Amino acid sequence: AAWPKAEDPALVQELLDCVQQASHYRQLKKGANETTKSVNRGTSELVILAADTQPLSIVLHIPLICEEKNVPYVYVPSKVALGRACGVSRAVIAVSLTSNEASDLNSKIRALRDKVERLA
Amino acid sequence: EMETMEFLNILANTGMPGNVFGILTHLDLFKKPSALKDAKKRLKHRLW
Amino acid sequence: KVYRRLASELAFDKATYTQFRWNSGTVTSVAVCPPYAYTTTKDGYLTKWKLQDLPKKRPERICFAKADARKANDKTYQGHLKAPLVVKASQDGKFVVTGGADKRLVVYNAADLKPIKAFTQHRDAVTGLAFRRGTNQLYSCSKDRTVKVWSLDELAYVETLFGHQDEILDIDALGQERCVSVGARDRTARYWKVPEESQLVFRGGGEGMDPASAAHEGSMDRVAMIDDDMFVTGSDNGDLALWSIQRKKPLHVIARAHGLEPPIKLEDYSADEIPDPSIIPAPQPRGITALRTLPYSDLIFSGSWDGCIRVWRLSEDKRKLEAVGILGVLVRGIVNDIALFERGGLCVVVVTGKEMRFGRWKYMKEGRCGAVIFEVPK
Amino acid sequence: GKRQITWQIQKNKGLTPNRKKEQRNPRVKKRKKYEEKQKKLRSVKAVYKGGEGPGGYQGELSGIKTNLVKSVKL
Amino acid sequence: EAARLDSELKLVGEYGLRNKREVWRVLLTLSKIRRAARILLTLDEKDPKRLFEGNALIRRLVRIGVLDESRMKLDYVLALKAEDFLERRLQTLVYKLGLAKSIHHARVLIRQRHIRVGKQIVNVPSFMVRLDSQKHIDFALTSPFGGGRPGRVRRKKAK
RNA sequence: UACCCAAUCCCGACACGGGGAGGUAGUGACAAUAAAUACUGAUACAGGGCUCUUUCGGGUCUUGUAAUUGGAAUGAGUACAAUUUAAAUCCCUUAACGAGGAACAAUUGGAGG
Numbered sequence: 024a025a026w027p028k029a030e031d032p033a034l035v036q037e038l039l040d041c042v043q044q045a046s047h048y049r050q051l052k053k054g055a056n057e058t059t060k061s062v063n064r065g066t067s068e069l070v071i072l073a074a075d076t077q078p079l080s081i082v083l084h085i086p087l088i089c090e091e092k093n094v095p096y097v098y099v100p101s102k103v104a105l106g107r108a109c110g111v112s113r114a115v116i117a118v119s120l121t122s123n124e125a126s127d128l129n130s131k132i133r134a135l136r137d138k139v140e141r142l143a
Numbered sequence: 144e145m146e147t148m149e150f151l152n153i154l155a156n157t158g159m160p161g162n163v164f165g166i167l168t169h170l171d172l173f174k175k176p177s178a179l180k181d182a183k184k185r186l187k188h189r190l191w
Numbered sequence: 192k193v194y195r196r197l198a199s200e201l202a203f204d205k206a207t208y209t210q211f212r213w214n215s216g217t218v219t220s221v222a223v224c225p226p227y228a229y230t231t232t233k234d235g236y237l238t239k240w241k242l243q244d245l246p247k248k249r250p251e252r253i254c255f256a257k258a259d260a261r262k263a264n265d266k267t268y269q270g271h272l273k274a275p276l277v278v279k280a281s282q283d284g285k286f287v288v289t290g291g292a293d294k295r296l297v298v299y300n301a302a303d304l305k306p307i308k309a310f311t312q313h314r315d316a317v318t319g320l321a322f323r324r325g326t327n328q329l330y331s332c333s334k335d336r337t338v339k340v341w342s343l344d345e346l347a348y349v350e351t352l353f354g355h356q357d358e359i360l361d362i363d364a365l366g367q368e369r370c371v372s373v374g375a376r377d378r379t380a381r382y383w384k385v386p387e388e389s390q391l392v393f394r395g396g397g398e399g400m401d402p403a404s405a406a407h408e409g410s411m412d413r414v415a416m417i418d419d420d421m422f423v424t425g426s427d428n429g430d431l432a433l434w435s436i437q438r439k440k441p442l443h444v445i446a447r448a449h450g451l452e453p454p455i456k457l458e459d460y461s462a463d464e465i466p467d468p469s470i471i472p473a474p475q476p477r478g479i480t481a482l483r484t485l486p487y488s489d490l491i492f493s494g495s496w497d498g499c500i501r502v503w504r505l506s507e508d509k510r511k512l513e514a515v516g517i518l519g520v521l522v523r524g525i526v527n528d529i530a531l532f533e534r535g536g537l538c539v540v541v542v543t544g545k546e547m548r549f550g551r552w553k554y555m556k557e558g559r560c561g562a563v564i565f566e567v568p569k
Numbered sequence: 570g571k572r573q574i575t576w577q578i579q580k581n582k583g584l585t586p587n588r589k590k591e592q593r594n595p596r597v598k599k600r601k602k603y604e605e606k607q608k609k610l611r612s613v614k615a616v617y618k619g620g621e622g623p624g625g626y627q628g629e630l631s632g633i634k635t636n637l638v639k640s641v642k643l
Numbered sequence: 644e645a646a647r648l649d650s651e652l653k654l655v656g657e658y659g660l661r662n663k664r665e666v667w668r669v670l671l672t673l674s675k676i677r678r679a680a681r682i683l684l685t686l687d688e689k690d691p692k693r694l695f696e697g698n699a700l701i702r703r704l705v706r707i708g709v710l711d712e713s714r715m716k717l718d719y720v721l722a723l724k725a726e727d728f729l730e731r732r733l734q735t736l737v738y739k740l741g742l743a744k745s746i747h748h749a750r751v752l753i754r755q756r757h758i759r760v761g762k763q764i765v766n767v768p769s770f771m772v773r774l775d776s777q778k779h780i781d782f783a784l785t786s787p788f789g790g791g792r793p794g795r796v797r798r799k800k801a802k
Numbered sequence: 803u804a805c806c807c808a809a810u811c812c813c814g815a816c817a818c819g820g821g822g823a824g825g826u827a828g829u830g831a832c833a834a835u836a837a838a839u840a841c842u843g844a845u846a847c848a849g850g851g852c853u854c855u856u857u858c859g860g861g862u863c864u865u866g867u868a869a870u871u872g873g874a875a876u877g878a879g880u881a882c883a884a885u886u887u888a889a890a891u892c893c894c895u896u897a898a899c900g901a902g903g904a905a906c907a908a909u910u911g912g913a914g915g
Contacts, residue, residue, distance in 0.1 A: 112550030145572040603656025612852040
């Protein structure tokens with residue numbers, strides 16, 4: 024059901040490290056409804072979705088809006104790891120990290136979405 | 144003081160002699176020798 | 192500080208356990224004052240307890256102290272406002288220190304359990320806490336990526352130490368004036384020379400089953416100094432790595448130290464009238480949640496949420512880690528903490544609950560909010 | 570009982586012209602010059618300035634002109 | 644020229660600089676680094692001079708955080724720029740970490756001694772913060788945003 | 803036309819006496835280095851602001867005000883001390899004051915009404 028699944032060799036941890044960097048930079052929206060609202064408002068640059076979700080239909084409904092707006096999306100295999108990487112003290116199943124006109128995080132964003140577009 | 148500035152411009156308007164020497168006194172009425180050199184510097188530059 | 196080797200002089204298959212529990216949310220950490228014990232529970236309790244002797248297997252609680260959040264406004268109240276997270280006890284038996292997420296670390300008398308000092312020097316939260324052995328010098332590493340060393344004899348802060356890239360999760364100390372502290376997602380254990388204010392970085396970058404289930408080193412959760420020259424770190428992809436101070440690399444890393452998780456059920460993963468196993472994600476390794484050692488010994492106690500508490504040992508050249516087996520040969524739940532004590536032959540308490548120490552990421556309906564006390568007599 | 574020297578003799582101002590509070594500080598002047606040259610830029614080209622708001626699409630809020638071709642003719 | 648004036652004004656506005664001397668200072672050190680990179684590209688590949696000196700230059704720039712850790716070639720060292728240097732300045736790092744509301748607020752804070760880099764407070768806003776030291780930018784303990792005394796206008800008002 | 807043998811060194815009946823080497827301080831826009839002269843809100847009111855190739859024509863959409871108020875931050879300076887030192891100074895520590903323009907008072911040039 025999750026066909027752009029991320030594989031093991033240092034791509035999941037690059038994703039979660041960029042997630043933690045954006046959460047320190049306050050450029051990140053947490054949870055399914057906030058990812059949905061950020062994609063529909065178009066400010067999203069990339070969206071990470073957990074794949075260990077009890078029933079997967081939530082992180083199945085998000086890729087439709089992401090494919091309609093043409094933003095990259097990728098599944099990491101642990102919502103507990105995604106919540107720990109964000110710094111939430113709750114398990115997060117969907118993470119969308121936005122765009123700003125001036126940062127140094129955007130280089131990591133660009134390399135990450137190049138790797139994700141190669142993954143798709 | 145105004146008497147010092149008055150004599151300086153009275154002398155300059157009437158006729159400037161060769162040698163005028165500024166003599167700065169009452170330096171012992173000071174407590175901080177950083178304020179002392181600051182006062183010497185600012186009084187020297189204003190006289191110049 | 193003499194070196195011991197008691198990895199073979201114990202009978203782990205003959206361990207005697209008391210798996211009890213009491214009215215608590217989730218117990219988090221324990222310290223070992225040599226007759227006593229000190230529990231912290233997320234309800235907001237710190238309970239000082241008395242252990243047992245053989246020549247009745249449950250402790251008798253003697254006293255506790257509760258966090259009072261009503262007097263956050265009210266001044267001259269040393270003590271916590273929120274629930275504490277870590278506790279340590281001085282080997283003198285006269286000081287007990289506890290730090291929580293209420294941005295302050297308090298320290299007081301062990302006997303009457305009445306708060307005497309409430310340090311507010313940290314800026315985010317207190318995550319890790321360690322004593323120098325035989326001395327009242329304290330090392331508290333925090334969530335604002337710093338670690339403050341305190342001189343507790345005069346009840347005073349002496350020095351701070353910066354340099355960690357992410358939030359600092361654990362710290363360990365030994366008899367000298369050093370530290371070893373692990374930070375989470377930077378994958379870094381920093382060895383701390385406190386008098387000259389210097390550090391030594393150790394960057395992990397860790398590397399018939401499914402291939403996508405082999406996860407790299409995500410965080411670096413727990414740390415344990417086993418002697419002066421080497422320590423061990425436990426990382427939430429299940430990596431247990433022995434590190435030497437003489438070398439820049441891991442000395443010996445062992446992978447998936449508590450195995451993989453079970454793959455989640457189709458009856459919860461997909462809401463369909465046909466459950467098909469054609470699609471199900473690869474399970475991830477259950478990482479180390481607690482990790483401890485006895486100082487100057489060959490004992491590596493590692494506990495995850497597998498329901499068992501594993502024990503490892505050093506090699507004869509002390510340049511490798513080796514398995515000696517599962518200790519409880521269950522102790523279900525998420526192993527929050529391990530504490531060790533020698534009778535003269537060792538009693539280890541294991542602190543487990545329904546979730547992890549710092550956040551409610553993984554709640555478990557299985558497991559109990561239990562201190563589980565077991566000893567090996569040989 | 571001494572005659573203090575006043576500020577006009579203390580610093581020899583003379584007849585320097587009157588300048589601005591913006592001109593007495595070279596950073597604040599270069600802040601206000603950038604705010605007004607970023608303002609002059611919006612009146613020539615079109616800045617992005619956020620997409621659709623949280624309220625949605627309230628129409629093209631300042632006119633639609635039909636006979637205007639604004640494409641670079643290659 | 645109008646191109647130089649508009650470029651320097653864009654730098655002075657986008658990063659809250661004081662004059663064009665700071666811009667020319669950064670352009671001078673950037674031209675020195677880029678000249679060293681061009682001189683190392685003059686030599687052929689697998690010359691030991693180019694190998695060790697280019698590895699030294701790239702490791703230096705990655706350690707001071709200007710060059711990204713992804714791209715580590717001498718061609719990207721040639722493709723370096725003054726916007727990257729002024730981004731590595733301290734004042735824009737305070738503005739981007741969000742201790743201050745604007746870049747001029749950040750310059751004001753660094754001047755009147757509120758933030759600290761690591762242990763010691765920093766009085767200069769052009770402090771080139773390295774990548775390892777980027778995280779430890781916070782309010783000092785003697786600042787009223789950090790703690791201690793409630794401060795000056797607070798004391799005059801609370802009296 | 804500054805101060806001292808206090809350190810390193812030298813000479814003598816000689817542990818003490820004597821040293822124009824040496825070290826300490828002062829000036830300095832000739833250069834060179836870092837950077838203050840402000841930061842941030844709310845309300846009220848006005849309807850225009852800006853631009854150009856092509857000009858009695860075209861382009862773009864939020865900008866102001868000597869308006870009314872509110873917050874904080876404070877180093878120059880003043881400065882108890884202690885310290886530094888041959889004795890002082892500087893440095894590092896440091897209690898107490900220290901911002902509303904009519905001021906704690908930015909300048910030099912050029913163009914124009």
